[PDB]
């Protein structure tokens, strides 16, 4: 019956962008059930323009959209929620561009009724690439906001708060939960949320380790054990959210060796060898920084002598290493946007009146 296309009169392109992107109450209800729906709407309009061969209309559409996105995020650089909604919708739109590209690669997990709605005329691969790029920009933007909202909490909870006897380590996980939920409620693909979480973990470990590299009154066995404990707490946060333990390795592993280092006896020509064999994810600079800034507060831990430090540094000669000490909070992981198909059939998509798009038409 219907085809899954959206007719728009080329003189309302502007108003379409206005009432679907710039102006948009992102919390209707259908959209709560299916977010990324605006992306589908957009691609239905695109499919309409493609069905006509009028290339100028297509290009004008894509440009108006991408500019509308760029703009709409540029207006809300302090709105985590909105940034999430548009990173989501952007990734959805790109995945629609891939899914109905017509390319053999993406028709793997397609309904026979879905393989009926591919683009029929134009190749939009270059546009897909551009979209991937802006998507990267948005992702980088929305990561920054989370990181900025959690950075002042890391240190006061991860170590300033003394467990082994007013913020605490729990608060960290509470914010992590806020971020995770906010991501999930915005149709943000699981793998994407995973990479985000990975970034967050990196940030935690980084701020922590850095504060170690600064404050001398933090390098103790006690503090090390405390840290290892908080790390296990984090692994448990992953377990609870059913996320892999792998990411916790590939983010906290340096901090583990840092905490492990703090506890281990630092005296005998054997301890040193263990420091060598175990601290494998740390630069010699970092290790030495810790061993020099290591100050004990308890009586069972014996202080580290300059001679021992020299022995260890001599043992570290076999490992070329890096000149890195601190871990900059602005490091970013390689974000990947994996193609995930859409379960929704365009033929049955309808516009809620809350979108103000009555001047459109299902084909």
UniProtKB/Swiss-Prot annotation:
Free-text tissue specificity from the UniProt record: Expressed chiefly in non-neuronal tissues. Particularly abundant in epithelial and glandular tissues including pancreas, prostate, mammary, stomach, colon and lung.
Membrane-spanning ranges: none
One of the protein's GO biological processes: actin filament organization
Ranges where the Dilute domain occurs: 63-318
Keyword Acetylation among UniProt keywords: yes
Gene Ontology CC: actin cytoskeleton; cytoplasm; extracellular exosome; membrane; myosin complex
GO molecular function: actin filament binding; ATP binding; calmodulin binding; microfilament motor activity
Keyword terms of this UniProt record: Acetylation, Actin-binding, ATP-binding, Calmodulin-binding, Coiled coil, Motor protein, Myosin, Nucleotide-binding, Repeat
Family stated for the protein in its record: Belongs to the TRAFAC class myosin-kinesin ATPase superfamily. Myosin family.
Function: May be involved in transferrin trafficking. Likely to power actin-based membrane trafficking in many physiologically crucial tissues.
Protein name: Unconventional myosin-Vc
Organism: Homo sapiens
Organism placement in taxonomy: Eukaryota, Metazoa, Chordata, Craniata, Vertebrata
Gene that this polypeptide is encoded by: MYO5C
């Amino acid at each position: 019956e219907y085809l899954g296309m959206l007719q728009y009169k080329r003189e309302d392109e502007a108003k379409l962008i206005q009432n679907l992107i710039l102006d948009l109450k992102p919390r209707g209800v259908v959209v709560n059930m299916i977010p990324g729906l605006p992306a589908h709407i957009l691609f239905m309009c695109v499919r309409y323009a493609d069905s006509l061969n009028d290339a100028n209309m297509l290009k004008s559409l894509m440009n108006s959209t991408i500019n509308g996105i760029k703009q709409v995020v540029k207006e809300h650089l302090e709105d985590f929620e909105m940034l999430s909604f548009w990173l989501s919708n952007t990734c959805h739109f790109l995945n629609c561009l891939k899914q109905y590209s017509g390319e053999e690669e993406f028709m793997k997990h397609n309904s026979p009724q879905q393989n009926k709605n591919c683009l029929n005329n134009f190749d939009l691969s270059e546009y897909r690439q551009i979209l991937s790029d802006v998507a990267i920009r948005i992702y980088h933007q929305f990561i920054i906001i989370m990181e900025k909202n959690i950075q002042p909490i890391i240190v006061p909870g991860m170590l300033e708060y003394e467990s082994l006897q007013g913020y605490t380590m729990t608060s960290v996980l509470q914010q992590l939960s806020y971020f995770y939920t906010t991501m999930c409620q915005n149709g943000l693909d699981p793998e994407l949320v995973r990479q985000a979480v990975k970034q967050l973990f990196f940030l935690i470990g980084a701020v922590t380790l850095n504060s170690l590299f600064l404050r001398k009154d933090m390098c103790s066995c006690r503090k090390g054990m405390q840290i290892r404990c908080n790390i296990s707490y984090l692994e448990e946060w992953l377990k609870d959210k059913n996320l892999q333990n792998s990411l916790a390795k590939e983010t906290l592993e340096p901090l583990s060796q840092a905490a492990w280092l703090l506890q281990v006896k630092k005296t005998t020509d054997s301890d040193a060898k263990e420091i060598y064999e175990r601290c494998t994810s740390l630069s010699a600079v970092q290790i030495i920084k810790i061993l020099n800034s290591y100050t004990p507060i308890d009586d069972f831990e014996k202080r580290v002598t300059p001679s021992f430090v020299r022995k260890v540094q001599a043992l570290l000669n076999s490992r070329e290493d890096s000149s890195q000490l601190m871990l900059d909070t602005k490091y970013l992981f390689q974000v990947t946007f994996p193609f995930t198909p859409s379960p929704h059939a365009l033929e049955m998509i309808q516009i809620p009146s809350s979108f103000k798009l009555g001047f459109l038409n299902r084909l």
